[PDB]
């Protein structure tokens, strides 16, 4: 489906893809290779969606956190640099790339938000959020407002739920049974958020252009923003300051860092282009530079253009907020995470649910997955065997522990009455090794996901994995069950994610089926 002998980029539309389109225009010269940039809307969930059929760019530039998702579904190729390559940027975007120890993208540029102000309105911008009201009000007697910034992308918002000990996984590698987004610090972050919308200090529909808009004539006085934003604040000769970000209850703001990334499509047939462009021209003084005279990068990757770049005081606040901040995880379960704080963010700021009404739907969304497995798991394992597991349940371990107990009677109901249909389909696949599984999986995937959504549906689903999970240890393929509990466990929780947060999760199974 991807057509050879050329390059097609996808980039976020913030980004500097006619900086990119110029290194795409050098590259041709050279090569006579044409390369098209594109910025299509949503490329970050458009990218798995035709990635997946072997279709989408050769290249995709977006915040590293997304690409172990990607690399995980198999649509990123391994990058191999050389060392004399690897050497050429900062080791540590390096691991912002890294993913079950291989290399699946080129790091571009460290991101941290800033707090942006203008100078002849606050001459002296606030250290603290709790006097930004009284800011607001000294400012809203003038004409103009303290602060606008995008509150539809939780990325804004999260270094402030995050400053009094709000966290998405746990590190101390990253613990995905321990998220801490309904915890005392998020709804401490989330609560003052949402007190500054309700004493009309920031209005919940605020998006990016709004805030962008405001702040760049010269109406707010304060934006919360990346340094990709810097060109048309610069382009509006606001008189601005790029600094740290308010402290909240005394305590850094946390942005999550993002190092912009570069990831080659699996299903590329340029893979060779895609490398010598990514590696050659793009990861140069002058490429890095064409890009960043569009839409400033942030920290560059590139040691030789960062060491030209790091006297900017933009850059030096920049890195000041990410060294309070945190790199990203890169793991499969950001994409639901995301998904599940944009949500909680945009409900608590418009009223529809509270703050601990939100926070907690959020926090059910980003276990979801890890939760789901482990049930699964566990199930088909001990179907398996005949034998539990005798590891405890971790955290919500009494959610798992009933969620197990209830599948063990219902599930086993389900095999005993349609062991017909079941036995059937078994027999029908020829399941004799691991290719056999894979394909079922495919299969499975495509019934359970044309179909509607209820707890018989999703029992059937994991009883079947029970039913096929016997098979295989009976043939001593048993190492082909946990791969199955994830298949399962992927198709259950991607394609009925919001049906799941409805039911409360897994104790929404547990109460459907108490008797
Ligand atoms: C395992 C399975 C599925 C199935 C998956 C499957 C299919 C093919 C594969 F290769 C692998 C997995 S993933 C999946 N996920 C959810 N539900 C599924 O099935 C149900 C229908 C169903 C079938 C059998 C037993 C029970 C049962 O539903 C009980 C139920 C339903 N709704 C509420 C409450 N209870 C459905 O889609 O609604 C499936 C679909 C049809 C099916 O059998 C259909 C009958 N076939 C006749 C021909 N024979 C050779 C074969 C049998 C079977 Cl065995
Ligand atoms: O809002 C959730 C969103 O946050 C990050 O996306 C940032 C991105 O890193 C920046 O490069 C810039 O474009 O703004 C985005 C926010 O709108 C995550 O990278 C992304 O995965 C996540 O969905
Ligand atoms: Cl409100």
């Known amino acids: 489906k991807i057509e050879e002998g050329k390059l097609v980029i996808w980039i976020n539309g913030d980004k500097g893809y006619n900086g990119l389109a110029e290194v795409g225009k050098k590259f041709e010269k050279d090569t006579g290779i044409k390369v098209t940039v594109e910025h299509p809307d949503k490329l970050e969930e458009k990218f798995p969606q035709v990635a997946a059929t072997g279709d989408g760019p050769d290249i995709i530039f977006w915040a590293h956190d997304r690409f172990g998702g990607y690399a995980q579904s198999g649509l990123l190729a391994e990058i191999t640099p050389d060392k004399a390559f690897q050497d050429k940027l900062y080791p540590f975007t390096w691991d912002a790339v890294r993913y079950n120890g291989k290399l699946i993208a080129y790091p571009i540029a460290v991101e941290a938000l800033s707090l942006i102000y203008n100078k002849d309105l606050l001459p002296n911008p606030p250290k603290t959020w709790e006097e930004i009201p009284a800011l607001d009000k000294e400012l809203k007697a003038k004409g103009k407002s303290a602060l606008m910034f995008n509150l539809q992308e939780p990325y804004f918002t999260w270094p402030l739920i995050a400053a009094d000990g709000g966290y998405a996984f746990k590190y101390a590698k990253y613990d995905i049974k321990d998220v801490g987004v309904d915890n005392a610090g998020a709804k401490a972050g989330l609560t003052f958020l949402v007190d500054l919308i309700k004493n009309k200090h920031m209005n919940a529909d605020t998006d990016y252009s709004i805030a962008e808009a405001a702040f760049n004539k010269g109406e707010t006085a304060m934006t919360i923003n990346g340094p990709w934003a810097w060109s048309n604040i610069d382009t509006s000769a606001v008189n601005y300051g790029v600094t740290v970000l308010p402290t909240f209850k005394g305590q850094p703001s946390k942005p999550f860092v993002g190092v912009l990334s570069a990831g080659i499509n699996a299903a590329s047939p340029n893979k060779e282009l895609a490398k010598e462009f990514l590696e050659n021209y793009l990861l140069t003084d002058e490429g890095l530079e064409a890009v960043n005279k569009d839409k400033p990068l942030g920290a560059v990757a590139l040691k030789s253009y960062e060491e030209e770049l790091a006297k900017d005081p933009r850059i030096a606040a920049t890195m000041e907020n990410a060294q309070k901040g945190e790199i ?33 739907d959020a926090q059910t969304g980003s276990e979801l997955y890890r939760q789901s497995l482990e049930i699964i798991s566990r199930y088909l394992r001990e179907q398996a065997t005949g034998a539990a597991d005798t590891a405890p349940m971790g955290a919500s371990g009494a959610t798992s522990r009933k969620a197990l107990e209830t599948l ?11 062991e017909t249909a079941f036995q059937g389909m078994l027999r029908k696949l020829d399941i004799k090794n691991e290719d056999d599984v894979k394909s079922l999986s495919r299969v499975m995937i495509h019934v359970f996901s044309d179909g509607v959504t209820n707890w018989g549906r999703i029992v059937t689903l994991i009883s079947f994995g029970a039913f096929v999970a016997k098979h295989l240890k009976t043939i001593n393929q048993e190492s082909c069950i946990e791969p199955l509990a994830e298949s399962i466990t992927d198709v259950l929780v991607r394609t009925k994610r919001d049906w799941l947060v409805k039911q409360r999760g897994w104790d929404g199974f547990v109460e459907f089926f108490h008797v």
Request: no cysteine.
């Open 408 to 418: 063990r009677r219902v599930g086993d109901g389900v095999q005993r009455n349609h």
């Open 328 to 360: 990203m995880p890169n793991i499969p379960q950001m994409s639901a995470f995301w998904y599940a704080v944009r949500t909680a963010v945009i409900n608590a700021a418009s009223g529809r649910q509270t703050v601990d009404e939100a926070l907690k």
